[PDB]
């Protein structure tokens, strides 16, 4: 009578409680600084905020009953403590017997595990509160949040293939937009690193939050480029040219991505480099072949930021913003090229 989603959830959390297990309590008490009260405080605060926003209605979302909210919270708290256990049991420090006070006092990790847990609970019930509702309600930076998604996938083999697909999916929403927000902390991370964007070779072939974000951004872009390149029948050595233009846009004109979508910068490069090449392709061909990809939706080429505000079209954005800042680079290929991952 329950959906495959809700049934998997129900069977993941069976026999488990909204509290730390005695195995976790022992790991907490092993640490110099016991994290249990900080962890319970974060959960109570996230708990109150989730049910306050769930209960009250907004134009966007009508508010639902507290009784459904409390159940959704209890299931997410049960997921939280079970997943925290598997993560902590399996950290190399635990396995070498070394104190885990530093790991367990990172507030950002606990808040973003609780929020993914809530996203799992809400997706499984096909909640109308589509991501990123939960991270906006909880004041969680995509740039910091997206890193727990990979851990959760690794730390709970009970998750359905559909759930891992949803979690990979929202990971890809953050890497294509969301983390390129004017208010995102990737801009602060870039500033503390002299505004030096990592290159594909420096991450794919240093280490830190900016590097593994770019790591992840590059490999999403890599996968998406091969797919437009195969659907458009274009070359495989031109492919390395538009990647080098894409890397140039990310490294030397990072601002172009502010309040924008990575696809917008990926397709604009494809047209430029192809037109600079004999391998000319045009936007309708590019847009129709992209229209097939799963994240491709109307808004990404019929609504593009121009000034911050006015919004237009992919071609208006290409000509008004993209060709001035990228034409000088593209003309060189009518030179060094960047290594394409895999």
């Amino acid at each position: 009578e329950f959906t495959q989603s809700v049934s998997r959830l129900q069977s993941i959390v069976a026999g488990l409680k909204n509290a730390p297990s005695d195995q976790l309590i022992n790991i907490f008490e092993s640490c110099v600084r016991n994290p249990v009260e900080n962890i319970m405080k974060i959960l109570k605060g996230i708990g109150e905020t989730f049910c306050q926003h769930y209960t009250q209605s907004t134009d966007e979302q009508p508010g639902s009953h507290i009784d459904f909210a409390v159940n959704r919270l209890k299931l997410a708290e049960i997921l939280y403590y079970k997943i925290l256990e598997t993560v902590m049991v399996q950290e190399t420090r635990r396995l070498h017997g070394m104190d885990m006070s530093v790991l367990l006092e990172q507030d950002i990790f606990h808040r973003s595990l609780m929020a993914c847990c809530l996203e799992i609970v809400l997706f499984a019930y096909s909640s109308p509160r589509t991501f990123p509702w939960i991270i906006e309600v909880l004041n969680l930076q995509p740039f910091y949040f997206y890193k727990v998604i990979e851990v959760v996938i690794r730390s709970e083999e009970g998750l359905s293939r559909d759930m891992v697909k949803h979690l990979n999916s929202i990971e890809e929403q953050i890497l294509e937009s969301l983390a390129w927000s004017h208010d995102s902390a990737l801009w602060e991370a870039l500033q503390v690193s002299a505004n030096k964007v990592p290159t594909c070779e420096e991450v794919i072939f240093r280490t830190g939050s900016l590097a593994l974000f770019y790591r992840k951004v590059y490999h999403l872009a890599s996968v998406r480029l091969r797919d437009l390149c195969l659907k458009l029948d274009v070359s495989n050595e031109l492919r390395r040219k538009i990647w080098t233009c894409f890397e140039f846009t990310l490294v030397h004109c990072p601002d172009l991505m502010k309040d924008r979508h990575l696809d917008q910068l990926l397709l604009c490069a494809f047209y430029i480099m192809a037109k600079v090449t004999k391998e000319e392709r045009t936007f309708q061909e590019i847009m129709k072949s992209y229209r097939n990809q799963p994240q491709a939706n109307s808004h990404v080429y019929r609504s593009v930021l121009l000034k911050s505000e006015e919004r237009g079209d992919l071609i208006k954005f290409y000509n008004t913003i993209y060709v001035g800042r990228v034409k000088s680079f593209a003309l060189k290929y009518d030179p060094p090229l960047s290594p394409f991952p895999h």
């Binding site: 047209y271 600079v276 936007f283 309708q284 000509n319």
Partner: peptide
């Protein structure tokens, strides 16, 4: 110049 005069479908 590098550019396009192509419109798009609705």
């Amino acid at each position: 110049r590098i550019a396009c005069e192509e419109e798009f479908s609705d």
